[PDB]
Amino acid sequence: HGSRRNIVGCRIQHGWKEGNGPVTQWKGTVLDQVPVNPSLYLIKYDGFDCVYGLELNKDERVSALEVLPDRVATSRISDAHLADTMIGKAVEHMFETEDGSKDEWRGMVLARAPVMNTWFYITYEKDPVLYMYQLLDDYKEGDLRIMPDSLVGKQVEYAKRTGMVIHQVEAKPSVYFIKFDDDFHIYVYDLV
Numbered sequence: 148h149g150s151r152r153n154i155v156g157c158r159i160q161h162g163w164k165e166g167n168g169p170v171t172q173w174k175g176t177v178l179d180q181v182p183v184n185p186s187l188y189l190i191k192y193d194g195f196d197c198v199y200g201l202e203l204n205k206d207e208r209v210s211a212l213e214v215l216p217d218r219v220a221t222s223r224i225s226d227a228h229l230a231d232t233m234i235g236k237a238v239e240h241m242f243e244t245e246d247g248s249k250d251e252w253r254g255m256v257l258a259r260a261p262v263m264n265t266w267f268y269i270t271y272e273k274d275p276v277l278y279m280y281q282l283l284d285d286y287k288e289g290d291l292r293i294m295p296d297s298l299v300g301k302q303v304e305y306a307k308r309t310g311m312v313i314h315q316v317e318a319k320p321s322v323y324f325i326k327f328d329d330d331f332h333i334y335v336y337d338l339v
């Protein structure tokens with residue numbers, strides 16, 4: 148009935164059209180495939196640090212999906228001990244604004260990212276979606292300071308809106324990834 152190759156670990160490009168807007172072009176890297184919903188992929192789009200969830204084969208807003216011949220480089224971590232003990236910790240993450248002023252955001256390092264092995268999954272208190280950064284390099288730069296059964300498959304309802312729990316964070320088993328309807332962000336909540 149039709150068999151194709153898997154796209155996890157591959158870089159892709161596709162067109163995007165929402166509403167009466169024009170078709171825009173995008174490049175990205177497919178990070179993983181959700182077990183409790185294999186149609187849902189986690190993608191890191193070129194030039195942005197949020198991890199997004201899209202059904203790249205069923206979403207009618209997607210067009211001209213192609214797989215690139217690019218091979219994501221398998222670099223070596225410059226500091227395995229720091230990379231290992233940093234996971235699961237609360238952090239202060241320094242960012243830079245327009246005027247050059249510095250914003251500092253409370254976050255938590257969740258895990259090492261797949262496919263891009265020098266990047267880290269991280270979420271923030273005032274922005275609880277899934278982010279990806281090369282945290283070891285910010286740490287050396289001095290912009291990162293470190294501080295001292297599964298619900299996957301269930302649905303969660305919030306009043307601000309329904310989503311599904313798609314992943315349990317290993318280092319913090321009460322923290323889960325949630326994919327909400329009609330929102331391509333991956334939310335990171337503590338479900339207690």
Ligand SMILES: O=C(c1ccc(C(=O)N2CCC(CCN3CCCC3)CC2)c(Nc2ccccc2)c1)N1CCC(CCN2CCCC2)CC1
Nearest residue numbers: 163173192194195196197199201240242252271273274331
């Ligand atoms: O460049 C972005 C950015 C990104 C995405 C977005 C943003 O929302 N999008 C951009 C790309 C995404 C790909 C998914 N589609 C791509 C094809 C299919 C679906 C989705 C949409 C954004 N939007 C924007 C830009 C200008 C004016 C109005 C809206 C902006 N930044 C700068 C860094 C900042 C960091 C915030 N964290 C710092 C500490 C804690 C929070 C985030 C915003």
Ligand SMILES: [Cl-]
Nearest residue numbers: 251252253273
């Ligand atoms: Cl904060």
Ligand SMILES: [Mg+2]
Nearest residue numbers: 239251252253
């Ligand atoms: Mg603070």
